[PDB]
Scaffold this active site. Structure first.
Site, PDB file in Angstrom:
ATOM      1  N   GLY A  12      26.337  47.149  36.973  1.00  0.00           N
ATOM      2  CA  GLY A  12      25.895  48.251  36.143  1.00  0.00           C
ATOM      3  C   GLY A  12      24.592  47.915  35.444  1.00  0.00           C
ATOM      4  N   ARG A  34      32.198  44.908  44.124  1.00  0.00           N
ATOM      5  CA  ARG A  34      32.752  45.561  45.309  1.00  0.00           C
ATOM      6  C   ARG A  34      32.003  45.212  46.588  1.00  0.00           C
ATOM      7  NH1 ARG A  34      35.817  50.124  44.966  1.00  0.00           N
ATOM      8  NH2 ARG A  34      36.092  49.686  47.199  1.00  0.00           N
ATOM      9  N   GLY A  75      32.339  50.240  33.340  1.00  0.00           N
ATOM     10  CA  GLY A  75      31.995  51.609  33.024  1.00  0.00           C
ATOM     11  C   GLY A  75      32.663  52.522  34.023  1.00  0.00           C
ATOM     12  N   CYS A 108      32.360  45.286  25.971  1.00  0.00           N
ATOM     13  CA  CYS A 108      31.611  46.443  25.506  1.00  0.00           C
ATOM     14  C   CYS A 108      32.437  47.716  25.601  1.00  0.00           C
ATOM     15  CB  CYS A 108      30.343  46.570  26.344  1.00  0.00           C
ATOM     16  SG  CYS A 108      29.150  47.786  25.760  1.00  0.00           S
ATOM     17  N   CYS A 187      27.147  36.111  21.595  1.00  0.00           N
ATOM     18  CA  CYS A 187      28.545  36.049  21.192  1.00  0.00           C
ATOM     19  C   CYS A 187      29.305  34.922  21.875  1.00  0.00           C
ATOM     20  CB  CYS A 187      29.221  37.381  21.501  1.00  0.00           C
ATOM     21  SG  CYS A 187      28.631  38.794  20.488  1.00  0.00           S
TER      22      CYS A 187
HETATM   23 NA    NA Z   1      30.361  46.577  42.118  1.00  0.00          NA
END
Ligand code: NA
Ligand code: NA
Length: 205
Positions: A12, A34, A75, A108, A187
């Site tokens: 993403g 994927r 997402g 997130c 973080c």
């Molecule tokens: Na992917």
């Protein structure tokens, strides 16, 4: 310290820059994707690629095995329909972390989890519902969990100069995807945000 990390959601928009920045910082990075051709074939590249699905528990387990910490940037491929793909992915990630004894997760969701519910835009309510489910999974796990709740994610160049607001909304409504990835990685170097919600934001003009 943290040296081996898994990144979920690395293909993403925030994931890709988080991945590049993590490799540049010297992390040994594993990703679950994927299709390995969705990752850049030049420049900084992760040490390990697992090809599979975050909705499959065994694929996630192979990705979490041996890590020191986990970054979650899942997402919905810009689909606003009712969904459980983020919370079910998080459920698999937490289950594998528990099996392997991995404690640290930076994940997130969105700043809408810090809004008055009466002001969340209706069009974004279904995605926000699953972000709430995902945050619940992570908060209830008892793992060391940094909840990153960003406002609108932009394309501005990396600054490293953003504000981090704890347990509330911050004074800007935008964060660059590059600054957001930079903060994700920060973080990993500190425990001071564990158990808190964090809102990175910046004024870019
Ligand atoms: Na992917
Ligand atoms: Na802020």
């Amino acid at each position: 310290a943290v040296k081996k990390i898994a990144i979920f959601g690395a293909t993403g928009q925030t994931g890709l820059t988080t991945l590049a920045q993590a490799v540049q910082a010297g992390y040994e990075v594993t990703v679950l994707v994927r299709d390995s051709s969705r990752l850049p074939s030049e420049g900084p590249r992760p040490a390990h690629v697992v090809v599979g699905d975050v909705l499959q528990a065994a694929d996630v387990d192979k990705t979490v095995a041996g890590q020191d910490a986990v970054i979650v940037l899942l997402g919905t491929r810009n689909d606003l329909s009712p969904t459980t793909v983020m919370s079910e992915g998080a459920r698999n990630i937490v289950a594998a972390m528990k099996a392997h004894g991995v404690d640290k997760v930076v994940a997130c969701t969105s700043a809408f989890l810090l809004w008055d519910p009466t002001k969340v835009p209706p069009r974004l309510q279904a995605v926000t519902d699953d972000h709430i489910r995902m945050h619940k999974v992570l908060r209830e796990s008892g793992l060391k969990y940094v909840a990153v709740m960003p406002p609108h994610i932009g394309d501005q160049p990396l600054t490293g100069a953003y504000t981090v607001t704890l347990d509330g909304r911050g004074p800007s409504r935008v964060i660059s995807k590059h600054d957001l990835g930079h903060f994700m990685l920060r973080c990993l170097t500190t425990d001071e945000y564990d158990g808190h919600s964090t809102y990175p934001s910046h004024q870019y003009q």
